[PDB]
């Protein structure tokens, strides 16, 4: 089938640019477990030209992986080989030869944006609205880049953004990302694996994913940022989202949120995907709020 073809092709592809000697990689503590796989802290000796050890993160399959999970890891590898942006997690290499598939990626010392925000508060860690706006802007910059590359991320959420040295955002978790060069849309007959509460109305009902459904997810992400890692649609069961969204309901303006910021969220969640802003516009709106605050 499609996966068996991918695995065979992968196992023969002589890939000197990305292949890394397993013996030069030492794995450490678990940093997290996504639904497709797990990430562990690691160190790699003589990685891509750097003398000595470099601390990295390593993505691998969980125990008892399914074909779905294996497909997603292979896909993430294939996507990450083609992307290069300061706000997208960087790929360093892979170990594929004499053991389980390991992807070697950039380590982000602060962990997920969600965890970073929830440990904070607005003025443990002290964040200003300026900082919050900055975070969103960096993510929007990254997304503009991916959208230009005709990639749809599909799984944008604070748990999928990492925070690197200098509080720099890194979009991560490309296992569900898909190329839309030919049709500008990705459509799947089967039920998706993205959490319901982050999905655009047309993804939930019609299984259509585009850059403008990424924009909807960004609006949920914006809400998570503004609420310092709140839970979307709190107390509302996911099965209720079909009716709630189709009848035009959206999350209300949260506390410590300007009318301008809330307006941007609502715009991300317009029923009609064509009425939603593009990432370029999102970046311009955020930069504007940043300078108006000074
Ligand atoms: N690449 C990564 N770097 C740091 N912490 C992480 N948690 C999950 N993935 C991570």
Query: Looking at the domain assignment, is residue 2 inside a domain?
Result: no
Torsion over CA: 190, 194, 196, 199 (sign): negative
Q: Are residues 157 and 51 in the same domain?
A: no
Give distance in angstroms: CA of 54 to centre of ligand 1: 14
130 closest CA partner among 232, 70, 138, 215: 138
Query: Looking at the domain assignment, is residue 172 inside a domain?
Result: yes
Q: Are residues 132 and 51 in the same domain?
A: no
Ligand 1 nearest-atom number relative to CA 170: 1
Q: Are residues 254 and 161 in the same domain?
A: yes
Give distance in angstroms: CA of 23 to centre of ligand 1: 22
Q: What are phi and psi of 128, to 5 degrees?
A: -100, 165
Q: What are phi and psi of 208, to 5 degrees?
A: -105, 130
Q: Annotated catalytic residue: which of 155, 173, 214, 285? A: 155
Torsion over CA: 141, 293, 274, 157 (sign): positive
Distances (CA, A) of 204 to 5, 194, 241: 30, 10, 9
Cβ within 8 Å of residue 55, ≥6 positions away: 41, 42, 43, 107
The enclosing domain of 272 has a CATH number of 1.10.510.10
Residue range of the domain that includes 268: 108-291
CB 209 within 8 A of CB 187: yes
Q: Residue 211: left if φ>0, alpha if ψ -120 to 50, beta else—which one?
A: alpha
Give distance in angstroms: CA of 123 to centre of ligand 1: 27
Q: Are residues 26 and 91 in the same domain?
A: yes
Q: Are residues 77 and 116 in the same domain?
A: no
CB 172 within 8 A of CB 89: yes
When divided into structural domains, the chain yields a total of 2
Experimentally determined by:
X-ray
Identify the helix (H) or strand (E) that includes residue 132.
helix 129-148
The enclosing domain of 61 has a CATH number of 3.30.200.20
Query: Looking at the domain assignment, is residue 231 inside a domain?
Result: yes
Q: Are residues 112 and 99 in the same domain?
A: no
Q: Are residues 273 and 223 in the same domain?
A: yes
Query: Looking at the domain assignment, is residue 3 inside a domain?
Result: no
Q: Are residues 96 and 151 in the same domain?
A: no
Cβ atoms within 10 Å, residue 166? 7
Q: Are residues 87 and 122 in the same domain?
A: no
Quote the strand ranges of 77-230, DSSP E. 91-95, 102-105, 120-122, 125-127, 151-152, 161-164, 168-171, 178-179, 186-187, 208-209
Q: Are residues 202 and 266 in the same domain?
A: yes
| 281 among known catalytic residues | no
Task: Among 87, 107, 127, give the residue marking a domain's end.
Answer: 107
Cβ within 8 Å of residue 22, ≥6 positions away: 95, 97, 98, 99, 102
Task: Among 85, 107, 129, give the residue marking a domain's end.
Answer: 107
Query: Looking at the domain assignment, is residue 1 inside a domain?
Result: no
Q: Are residues 183 and 259 in the same domain?
A: yes
CA atoms within 13 A on the CB side of 256: 17
Return the CA Rg of the chain: 19
Q: Are residues 85 and 157 in the same domain?
A: no
Residues with CB under 6 A from ligand 1: 31-32, 39, 57, 105, 107-108, 111-112, 162
């Amino acid at each position: 089938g499609p996966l068996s073809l991918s695995v065979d092709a992968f196992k023969i592809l002589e890939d000197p640019k990305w292949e890394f000697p397993r013996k030069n990689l030492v794995l450490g503590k678990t940093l997290g477990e996504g639904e497709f796989g797990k990430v562990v802290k690691a160190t790699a000796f003589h990685l891509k030209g750097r003398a000595g050890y470099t601390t990295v993160a390593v993505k691998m399959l969980k125990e008892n992986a399914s074909p779905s999970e294996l497909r997603d890891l292979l896909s993430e590898f294939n996507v990450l080989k083609q992307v290069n942006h300061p706000h997208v997690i960087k790929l360093y290499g892979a170990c594929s030869q004499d053991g389980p598939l390991l992807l070697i990626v950039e380590y982000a010392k602060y962990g997920s944006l969600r965890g970073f925000l929830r440990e904070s508060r607005k003025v443990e860690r002290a964040l200003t609205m300026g900082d919050l706006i900055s975070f969103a802007w960096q993510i929007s910059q990254g997304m503009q880049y991916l959208a230009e590359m005709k990639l749809v991320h599909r799984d944008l959420a604070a748990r999928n953004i990492l925070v690197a040295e200098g509080r720099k955002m890194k979009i991560s978790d490309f296992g569900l990302s898909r190329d839309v060069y030919e049709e500008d849309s990705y459509v799947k007959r089967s039920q998706g694996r993205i959490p319901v509460k982050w999905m655009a109305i047309e993804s939930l009902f019609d299984h259509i994913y585009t850059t403008q459904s990424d924009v909807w997810s960004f609006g949920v992400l914006l809400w998570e940022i503004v609420t310092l890692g709140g839970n979307p649609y709190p107390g509302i069961p996911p099965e209720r989202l079909f009716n709630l969204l189709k009848t035009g309901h959206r999350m209300e303006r949260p506390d410590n949120c300007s009318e301008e910021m809330y307006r941007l969220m609502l715009q991300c969640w317009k029923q009609e995907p064509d009425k939603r802003p593009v990432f370029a516009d999102i970046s311009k709106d955020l930069e504007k709020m940043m300078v108006k605050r000074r």
